[PDB]
Design an enzyme around this catalytic site. Sequence first.
Site, PDB file in Angstrom:
ATOM      1  CG  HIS A 115     -32.465 -42.084 123.699  1.00 31.44           C
ATOM      2  ND1 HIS A 115     -32.889 -40.757 123.656  1.00 31.44           N
ATOM      3  CD2 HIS A 115     -32.020 -42.286 124.944  1.00 31.44           C
ATOM      4  CE1 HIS A 115     -32.674 -40.197 124.829  1.00 31.44           C
ATOM      5  NE2 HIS A 115     -32.148 -41.103 125.625  1.00 31.44           N
ATOM      6  CG  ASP A 130     -34.384 -39.637 120.942  1.00 26.60           C
ATOM      7  OD1 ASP A 130     -34.966 -40.724 121.174  1.00 26.60           O
ATOM      8  OD2 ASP A 130     -33.604 -39.092 121.756  1.00 26.60           O
ATOM      9  NE  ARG A 189     -21.246 -22.382 118.972  1.00 30.28           N
ATOM     10  CZ  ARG A 189     -20.258 -21.524 118.721  1.00 30.28           C
ATOM     11  NH1 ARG A 189     -19.017 -21.958 118.494  1.00 30.28           N
ATOM     12  NH2 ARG A 189     -20.508 -20.223 118.708  1.00 30.28           N
ATOM     13  NE  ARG A 225     -15.799 -27.266 111.737  1.00 29.87           N
ATOM     14  CZ  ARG A 225     -14.811 -27.446 110.857  1.00 29.87           C
ATOM     15  NH1 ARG A 225     -14.063 -28.546 110.892  1.00 29.87           N
ATOM     16  NH2 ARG A 225     -14.564 -26.520 109.935  1.00 29.87           N
ATOM     17  N   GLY A 246     -30.609 -38.740 132.464  1.00 36.54           N
ATOM     18  CA  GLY A 246     -31.789 -38.954 133.284  1.00 36.54           C
ATOM     19  C   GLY A 246     -32.900 -37.990 132.926  1.00 36.54           C
ATOM     20  CB  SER A 289     -33.150 -39.069 128.175  1.00 35.03           C
ATOM     21  OG  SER A 289     -31.822 -38.894 127.662  1.00 35.03           O
ATOM     22  N   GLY A 290     -36.106 -37.586 127.421  1.00 38.72           N
ATOM     23  CA  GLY A 290     -37.533 -37.824 127.322  1.00 38.72           C
ATOM     24  C   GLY A 290     -38.284 -36.682 127.953  1.00 38.72           C
TER      25      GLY A 290
HETATM   26  C1  LIG Z   1     -30.774 -39.024 128.683  1.00 37.69           C
HETATM   27  O1  LIG Z   1     -31.189 -38.405 129.899  1.00 37.69           O
HETATM   28  C2  LIG Z   1     -29.519 -38.238 128.194  1.00 37.69           C
HETATM   29  C3  LIG Z   1     -29.831 -36.758 127.926  1.00 37.69           C
HETATM   30  C4  LIG Z   1     -28.600 -35.982 127.458  1.00 37.69           C
HETATM   31  C5  LIG Z   1     -28.936 -34.533 127.192  1.00 37.69           C
HETATM   32  N1  LIG Z   1     -27.671 -33.809 127.154  1.00 37.69           N
HETATM   33  C6  LIG Z   1     -27.470 -32.489 127.208  1.00 37.69           C
HETATM   34  N2  LIG Z   1     -26.232 -32.070 127.451  1.00 37.69           N
HETATM   35  N3  LIG Z   1     -28.470 -31.604 127.024  1.00 37.69           N
HETATM   36  N4  LIG Z   1     -29.061 -38.841 126.894  1.00 37.69           N
HETATM   37  C7  LIG Z   1     -27.978 -39.590 126.641  1.00 37.69           C
HETATM   38  O2  LIG Z   1     -27.171 -39.892 127.522  1.00 37.69           O
HETATM   39  C8  LIG Z   1     -27.755 -40.066 125.172  1.00 37.69           C
HETATM   40  N5  LIG Z   1     -26.301 -39.832 124.851  1.00 37.69           N
HETATM   41  C9  LIG Z   1     -25.642 -38.628 124.843  1.00 37.69           C
HETATM   42  O3  LIG Z   1     -26.196 -37.558 125.103  1.00 37.69           O
HETATM   43  C10 LIG Z   1     -24.142 -38.585 124.507  1.00 37.69           C
HETATM   44  C11 LIG Z   1     -23.923 -38.217 123.042  1.00 37.69           C
HETATM   45  C12 LIG Z   1     -22.487 -37.773 122.796  1.00 37.69           C
HETATM   46  C13 LIG Z   1     -22.279 -37.407 121.351  1.00 37.69           C
HETATM   47  N6  LIG Z   1     -21.101 -36.543 121.271  1.00 37.69           N
HETATM   48  C14 LIG Z   1     -20.389 -36.193 120.186  1.00 37.69           C
HETATM   49  N7  LIG Z   1     -19.574 -35.141 120.188  1.00 37.69           N
HETATM   50  O4  LIG Z   1     -20.502 -36.921 119.101  1.00 37.69           O
HETATM   51  N8  LIG Z   1     -23.509 -39.875 124.782  1.00 37.69           N
HETATM   52  C15 LIG Z   1     -22.992 -40.202 125.973  1.00 37.69           C
HETATM   53  O5  LIG Z   1     -23.030 -39.386 126.938  1.00 37.69           O
HETATM   54  N9  LIG Z   1     -22.444 -41.452 126.091  1.00 37.69           N
HETATM   55  C16 LIG Z   1     -21.842 -42.052 127.336  1.00 37.69           C
HETATM   56  C17 LIG Z   1     -21.286 -43.450 127.023  1.00 37.69           C
HETATM   57  C18 LIG Z   1     -22.940 -42.162 128.461  1.00 37.69           C
HETATM   58  C19 LIG Z   1     -22.531 -42.361 129.845  1.00 37.69           C
HETATM   59  C20 LIG Z   1     -23.525 -42.455 130.898  1.00 37.69           C
HETATM   60  C21 LIG Z   1     -24.950 -42.354 130.587  1.00 37.69           C
HETATM   61 BR1  LIG Z   1     -26.263 -42.468 131.930  1.00 37.69          BR
HETATM   62  C22 LIG Z   1     -25.370 -42.162 129.231  1.00 37.69           C
HETATM   63  C23 LIG Z   1     -24.403 -42.067 128.181  1.00 37.69           C
HETATM   64  C24 LIG Z   1     -28.139 -41.588 125.057  1.00 37.69           C
HETATM   65  C25 LIG Z   1     -26.915 -42.546 124.955  1.00 37.69           C
HETATM   66  C26 LIG Z   1     -28.941 -41.777 123.774  1.00 37.69           C
HETATM   67  C27 LIG Z   1     -30.400 -40.513 128.961  1.00 37.69           C
HETATM   68  N10 LIG Z   1     -30.714 -41.485 128.155  1.00 37.69           N
HETATM   69  C28 LIG Z   1     -30.232 -42.694 128.680  1.00 37.69           C
HETATM   70  C29 LIG Z   1     -29.563 -42.520 129.891  1.00 37.69           C
HETATM   71  S1  LIG Z   1     -29.527 -40.904 130.379  1.00 37.69           S
END
Ligand SMILES: *[C@](=O)([C]([C][C][C][N][C]([N])[N])[N]C(=O)[C]([N]C(=O)[C]([C][C][C][N]C([N])=O)[N]C(=O)[N][C]([C])C1=[C][C]=C(Br)[C]=[C]1)[C]([C])[C])C1=N[C]=[C]S1
Length: 237
Positions: A44, A93, A161, A163, A186, A188-189
């Site tokens: 992703h 992923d 955690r 559901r 950030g 991610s990966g």
């Molecule tokens: C990656 O660095 C991050 C890593 C997140 C790892 N998180 C933890 N806490 N260990 N990945 C993402 O941002 C991915 N999206 C999300 O993690 C979440 C998923 C929420 C799902 N929740 C429920 N309950 O269903 N999405 C999210 O945060 N979305 C908002 C719109 C967002 C805002 C700002 C940024 Br920057 C990213 C997302 C991605 C979407 C697959 C990264 N990958 C890309 C950028 S940072």
Amino acid sequence: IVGGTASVRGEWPWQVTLHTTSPTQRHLCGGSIIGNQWILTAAHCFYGVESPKILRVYSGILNQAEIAEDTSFFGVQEIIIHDQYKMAESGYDIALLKLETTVNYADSQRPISLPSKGDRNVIYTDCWVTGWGYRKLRDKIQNTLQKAKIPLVTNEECQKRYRGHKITHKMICAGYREGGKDACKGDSGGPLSCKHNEVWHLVGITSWGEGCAQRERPGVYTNVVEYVDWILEKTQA
Ligand SMILES: *[C@](=O)([C]([C][C][C][N][C]([N])[N])[N]C(=O)[C]([N]C(=O)[C]([C][C][C][N]C([N])=O)[N]C(=O)[N][C]([C])C1=[C][C]=C(Br)[C]=[C]1)[C]([C])[C])C1=N[C]=[C]S1
């Protein structure tokens, strides 16, 4: 990384920082050196990426400040995304980056061993998450590589955690019931390195989570051991 601390230089030699040059250069995602010409990262992380030409892989980095226009980097020859990948939250992923040139191993940059099938029953009690991700939701890319020790949680516990989600055996979670330490935007990966018997193993790949470091919201990672066959298949010429 939330609730972590500054890493010691060279402490995570397999960690790379993946940059995109479009529109202007910036850190995009984390990654792990697993072969002289291979980086294992998250699929992703390539959303909106039409070509590998805009990617740059930097190894042996501690502070982003070390990266300037005159800094050497590895070009990306090919981006290999798992054919079943659709989105982070659905699994698969995982992606491989085939570098244009080989990485010369040294104390600052070397590969991390992949986990073995005969290790799914191993109790990793020393796992760490690293990367230049957000220290908080509204934060930005951190300069110094952060690290945080985080315990793995059973899939049954993780499912509780999340559901509305389906936590499969191809995922693995890590976090504190009370939150406080976790990966963030950030990271991610990035790798979820676990030390088992003096040897570091690439257990998971930072993938997703609800927010960052919230209580009862473990970070979700790609369960690397479930992809060793895929990795072998895609890396063999
Ligand atoms: C990656 O660095 C991050 C890593 C997140 C790892 N998180 C933890 N806490 N260990 N990945 C993402 O941002 C991915 N999206 C999300 O993690 C979440 C998923 C929420 C799902 N929740 C429920 N309950 O269903 N999405 C999210 O945060 N979305 C908002 C719109 C967002 C805002 C700002 C940024 Br920057 C990213 C997302 C991605 C979407 C697959 C990264 N990958 C890309 C950028 S940072």
